[PDB]
Design a protein around this ligand. Structure first.
Ligand SMILES: Cc1cc2nc3c(=O)[nH]c(=O)nc-3n(C[C@H](O)[C@H](O)[C@H](O)COP(=O)(O)OP(=O)(O)OC[C@H]3O[C@@H](n4cnc5c(N)ncnc54)[C@H](O)[C@@H]3O)c2cc1C
Ligand SMILES: [Mg+2]
Ligand SMILES: [Mg+2]
Ligand SMILES: [Mg+2]
Length: 299
């Protein structure tokens, strides 16, 4: 409509859409049923283990966000859990913006930069962005962040066990010794790729449009390609879509919640359209072993 949602509207939206997903009558061997179970585990981590220990309201928690599919799903679930914890469950504790941190780099996709900005508006994020043109490690960028915000005790991260170095991660654990000292809150670890697509497509939230063009994992602009397993060709078996129901039945909006388009950036569209190959969108990939296949070959 005429104005951006307030944080309470966004949180209530996320609670309603998550609740609606949980009410889908899905077969016990389905992706949707598995995703419902994943939601419930994430909710337990946030509602039972996280919020009672660290305040999401007063700056003790910041949310790490770069606009990708995994941290976007987590943000939706996190907003749902804020609403459930405080409004539905009446837990003891107004917040206008959610403290958020993005580590920006000189080789980030322009589409992602745009999508982070536009979703920060939609979700009422209070967005800290590290310096794009400073050469520094992620740990060093977070050390600066913690100097600015020394009240921060914990940061939410949308990492999954299937990501590199994800095997041994835990839902709540300290950073390593060579990092600034804070707790990592990692409530998405048990999600797999099929779960991410199912929920994100059902949500009817805007999704970074690189995924529409066949990306399944967003690394830097030089290394990242559309996923080769999603290349269209005349000779191979055509891919089938596992998420037709979710797209057809995606959560409906009203005048407050309707979403403005977040288009692909022109500079990325030129690049993609000049591959001489076309790709299915990323949600045609459900094999976690192949999530990072769209990368330039290195020696
Ligand atoms: C707050 C935080 C604390 C960390 N602490 C440790 C640590 O103690 N030891 C260690 O070895 N590694 C640490 N890491 C690194 C982390 O484990 C991943 O290796 C890193 O986020 C890059 O992820 P990826 O690109 O492989 O995967 P992706 O799947 O692309 O990203 C996984 C998640 O990382 C976060 N993320 C990735 N890139 C950015 C970015 N540019 N800005 C903000 N968030 C981003 C998002 O929440 C995202 O969902 C930390 C990362 C973060 C964000
Ligand atoms: Mg990811
Ligand atoms: Mg900047
Ligand atoms: Mg990535």
């Amino acid at each position: 409509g005429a104005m951006v949602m307030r944080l309470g509207d966004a949180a209530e939206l996320c609670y309603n859409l998550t609740s609606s997903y949980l009410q889908i009558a899905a077969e016990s061997d389905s992706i949707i049923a598995q995703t419902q179970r994943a939601i419930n585990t994430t909710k337990s981590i946030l509602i039972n283990e996280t919020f009672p220990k660290w305040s999401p309201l007063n700056g003790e928690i910041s949310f790490s966000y770069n606009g990708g599919k995994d941290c976007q799903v987590l943000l939706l679930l996190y907003l749902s859990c804020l609403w459930e914890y405080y409004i539905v469950k009446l837990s003891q504790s107004p917040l206008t913006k959610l403290p958020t941190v993005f580590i920006d780099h000189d080789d980030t996709f322009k589409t992602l930069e745009n999508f982070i900005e536009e979703t920060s508006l939609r979700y009422s994020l209070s967005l800290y962005e590290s310096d794009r043109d400073k050469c520094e490690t992620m740990a060093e960028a977070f050390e600066t962040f913690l100097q600015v915000f020394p009240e921060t005790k914990a940061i939410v991260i949308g990492i999954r066990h299937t990501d590199p170095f994800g095997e041994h991660l835990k839902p709540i654990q300290k950073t390593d010794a060579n990092w600034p000292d804070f707790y990592r809150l990692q409530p998405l670890l048990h999600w797999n790729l099929a779960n991410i697509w199912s929920f994100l497509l059902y949500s009817n939230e805007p999704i970074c449009e690189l995924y529409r063009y066949g990306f399944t994992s967003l690394g830097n602009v030089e290394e990242t390609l559309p996923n080769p397993h999603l290349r269209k060709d005349k000779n191979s078996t055509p891919l089938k879509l596992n998420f037709e129901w979710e797209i057809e039945n995606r959560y409906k909006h009203n005048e407050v919640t309707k979403a403005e388009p977040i288009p692909i950036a022109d500079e990325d569209l030129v690049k993609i359209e000049n591959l001489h190959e076309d790709y299915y969108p990323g949600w045609y990939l459900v094999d976690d072993k192949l999530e990072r296949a769209g990368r330039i070959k290195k020696k």
